[PDB]
Amino acid sequence: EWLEEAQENKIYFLLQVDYDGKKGKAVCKLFDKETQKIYALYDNTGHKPYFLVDLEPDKVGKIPKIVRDPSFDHIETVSKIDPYTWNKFKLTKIVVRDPLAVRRLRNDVPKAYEAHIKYFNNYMYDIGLIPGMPYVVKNGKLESVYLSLDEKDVEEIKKAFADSDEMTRQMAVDWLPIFETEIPKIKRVAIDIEVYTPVKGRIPDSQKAEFPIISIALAGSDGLKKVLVLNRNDVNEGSVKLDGISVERFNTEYELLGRFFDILLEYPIVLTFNGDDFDLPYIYFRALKLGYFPEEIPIDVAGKDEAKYLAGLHIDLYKFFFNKAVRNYAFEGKYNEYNLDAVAKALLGTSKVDTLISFLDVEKLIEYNFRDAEITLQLTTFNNDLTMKLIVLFSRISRLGIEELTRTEISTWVKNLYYWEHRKRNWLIPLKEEILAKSSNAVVIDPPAGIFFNITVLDFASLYPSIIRTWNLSYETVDIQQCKKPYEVKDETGEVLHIVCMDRPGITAVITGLLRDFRVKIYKKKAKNPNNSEEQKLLYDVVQRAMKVFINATYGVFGAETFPLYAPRVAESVTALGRYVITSTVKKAREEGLTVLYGDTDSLFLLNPPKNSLENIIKWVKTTFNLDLEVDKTYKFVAFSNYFGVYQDGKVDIKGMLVVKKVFNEVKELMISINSPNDVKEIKRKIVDVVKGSYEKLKIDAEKYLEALRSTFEQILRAFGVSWDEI
Ligand SMILES: [Mg+2]
Structure with a gap:
């Protein structure tokens, strides 16, 4: 298909695991820094989808809806540790042939455990995989690679955790690699399309794809600056540069998209901003109405709110920055709106438009289109690739693959860490119902x-x-x-x-404590420590930023009643x-x-x-x-x-x-910035605008408008003086 198979005894970075319905196997998506490509390793273990039930094998065998189901494989017996007592007990395990059969069969039994885990995560849990980390392919399986650490580095970790309990100390040595392992530079292209709109304010349905794509911009991290434009009332395909932007021109939209695919296919990652909903589906369905076969288009839009790029990963960054934990704890609340311009200003400081884009002449269309794509790439580039590094570390900590992680809330990220660690410990993941009832009394x-x-x-x-x-x-x-x-x-x-x-030890206490102490005792320090090289100074800085996100988000996710734990x-x-x-x-x-x-x-x-x-x-x-x-x-x-x-x-x-709200704001702040230990005359400068703004403004809104002027001043006068009237 679009992905070539990974080779025996080569080293790759795992980025995520998917499920191939066709081959009926989990597929690891493996990144190679040499070729800048993503390859596939299909599961060669016996692994199949399954869920657990606490009935007996012979009783499960008398449920004919399970046993006669075409996807029914077999029944086994496995053991688990009860988190409550740490006692070992047995459960029966219903293995089926495909993920969908787990969904179908899990309600033919009173109380199905581990039956709401997406198959690719359940595979990850059982194999013990960590995305964002390097592996060698040995006998068609992934083995972690040798990590070169300073002896002093590891002693420093062991000293900081010498007082902790057995669980923490071994968990600390087991996590070390994911904070000391280099992050790969992944080649990537942000893309952005523009489509024709006869009416101005009307976003076209990307499924119907009724109107032509008039341009696509591509900004690549390898220096690519491109805009492909559809010739509308003219006919020649000459190529030019526009302040560094390679512009190519096309008479048919068929060949415009043709060439968009050719360029896309050079990148292992495609970045968009709202491309799940708009850009990729629009391209995909235009391409079909233009004479592309389905199998020629390296996009899949069969998922509900998702667009997959079949020759790599598609990150829709709208969904990343809209993540609340990312917004508040990664980026300190610097944006309040989630559109491109809002995020870009907050994080890049880069500031509009006269008419709609369907009216624009070719030159301004090109600058405007490319700017969107350029900004999209730059959200991934600023501060030495900070957000690529955040994403990779977030994958490592949550053990979620990159595409699922950038499309999910942090409560999914924390849940996935905790399921993974339960499963590594052989602990049964409890039902949400049971946690309530086992809380009773x-x-x-x-x-x-x-x-x-x-x-x-x-x-x-x-x-x-x-x-x-x-x-x-x-x-x-x-x-x-x-x-x-x-x-x-x-x-x-x-x-x-x-x-x-x-x-x-409670698992939550162990994990939050371990994350916290990794941050304050070791990684905060290491990151701003002059003896470290600048390469590893940046790594450790991102490490502690990312730890912070999980630490500060922890109470919120565990405190929400929707959370499975x-x-x-x-x-x-x-x-x-x-x-x-x-x-x-x-x-x-x-x-x-x-x-x-x-x-x-x-x-x-x-x-x-x-x-x-x-x-x-x-x-x-x-x-x-x-x-x-x-x-x-x-x-x-x-x-x-x-x-x-x-x-x-x-x-x-x-x-x-x-x-009033602009000129008046600047006076209030420089007046209060004068502030010394004095008082009464400091407030008389500011009392000039109390009676002035309230009473002079004579020369939908009528006369109550002056209470809205008072609300950008209501609380400040309560400190100095008291309330008044002017009727
Ligand atoms: Mg645009």
């Missing part, structure tokens, strides 16, 4: 309003993740029946909301101990001479205290619980009413309350 402190001076803030570095590990919280250690070493988890009235077993008592125990830690840390500040103005879930705003008293409560947290409290910030001053920070170098951290 008031705010943050407010800020006084006004003006307060020289404030230092105190943050818990990563609070919820840190308490997950510190208190051994996991779905299998909270509110369980048989428990030798219980631990009470109270909140306020010493109520004892839940019990937590310390008999065994959601235990209400885990989530509730986390917030409980969160209150307990911040409440308790508040009392110690009140008994050290510290004045506590503001306090949310993991932060404490402190009124200029001595350096002696800060060091007391920090080291006190380390002895009471085992958390790291630290000196976050040092505001020049802050104002309250929801707050309004000010730094001594300029910039302000205005929490909320920022939705």
Whole structure:
């Protein structure tokens, strides 16, 4: 087909596994840096799709809907460890011939386990594969390659985990390679099409593909800059350059797409921005109405919300940046909108258009079309290929393949890590129902309003993740029946909301703790350490960024009730101990001479205290619980009413309350940047616009319009003065 088979005893980077319905096998998609191509290794083990049932082989054999099904293969018996007790028991295993038979047969039995795992992930779990990592093909199977590490590097890992439990220490050595292994440079082309629209504001159905493609832009990471354009009211195919952009011209759309395929086929990865929904399907269905056979088109659009590029991987980057964990934790909330221009400005700082693109002359169509594709490539290129590296590390940590990962929420990424590790341990992955039944048997402190001076803030570095590990919280250690070493988890009235077993390490506690400690104890440090070469400085930086994404996302996914491993008592125990830690840390500040103005879930705003008293409560947290409290910030001053920070170098951290609006904004911020310890005359400069903006504006909207001017100023005047009227 489009993919050539991988060769015996060559080395490739695994990128993902797919299922081939035709051959009925899992296929590993293997990247070769030498040829810059992707090859296929088809499973040569006996591996088939399956699910588990806790009935007996002879009873399952009397269910004729299973046994007489054409995809029915055979029944076996396997063993699993119960996460709750670590006891070994037996389950029966229904093996069928194809993934679809798993979906069909799993409800012919009362209670099917491991029956909602996509076949290519289930293969990954059982073989023990890690995408984004290098392997050698030995006897048609993948074997991991030798990793060259400094002895000092590995001693440094082992020292940081010497105090941890058996599970953590071996898991730490088992994960090391995925943080020390180089990331491959993968050749890639972002593409972007434009189609003809008679009416201006009307996005054409990409299935119907009613109108011609007028151009396609291709921006490649190997320097390619291309625009293929359809000659509309003229007829010659001459080629030219336009500020570095190779423009080719075509009289028929058939030959335009012909040549788009030829170029596409040079790349192992195609990048789009919303190409799953638009670009690739539009190309695919135009190509069919133009006289391409299905089998000549290296795109498949048979999947529901997906476009596959048959000679490699297609990453739709719309879906990557729209990922909420990527948006918030990878890129610090820098974009609020998910369209190309919004993401590009936030991450690249690169800023429109007169008419619709159907009206545009050839020259402006070419610049505009190419710019879209160029920006799409650059989202993958900025900061020494940061986002290619993030994607690869995210695959490694989640063990999800690249295409599934860039199209899924982080809760799918975390689920996949946890299923993988269960399966490596031979643990049964529990049903969501069973976690509920096996579980069976008031705010943050407010800020006084006004003006307060020289404030230092105190943050818990990563609070919820840190308490997950510190208190051994996991779905299998909270509110369980048989428990030798219980631990009470109270909140306020010493109520004892839940019990937590310390008999065994909880898997969630082990993994979040291990990720966290890999980050703070080793990789944060290593990344900004001058003795490291610049190549490995960048690797370690991405490593710690990516760790951060999973750490900070962990509570949110485990706290959502849709999550397959959601235990209400885990989530509730986390917030409980969160209150307990911040409440308790508040009392110690009140008994050290510290004045506590503001306090949310993991932060404490402190009124200029001595350096002696800060060091007391920090080291006190380390002895009471085992958390790291630290000196976050040092505001020049802050104002309250929801707050309004000010730094001594300029910039302000205005929490909320920022939705005339342009000229007036700049005056307010340079007036507040003047701020010294004075007060009453500082506010009279700003009171010029209270009565001015409110009362003078005479010379859908009528007279209530002036309350919308007041909402970009409502909370700031509450700090200084009080409320007023002008009727
Ligand atoms: Mg475009």
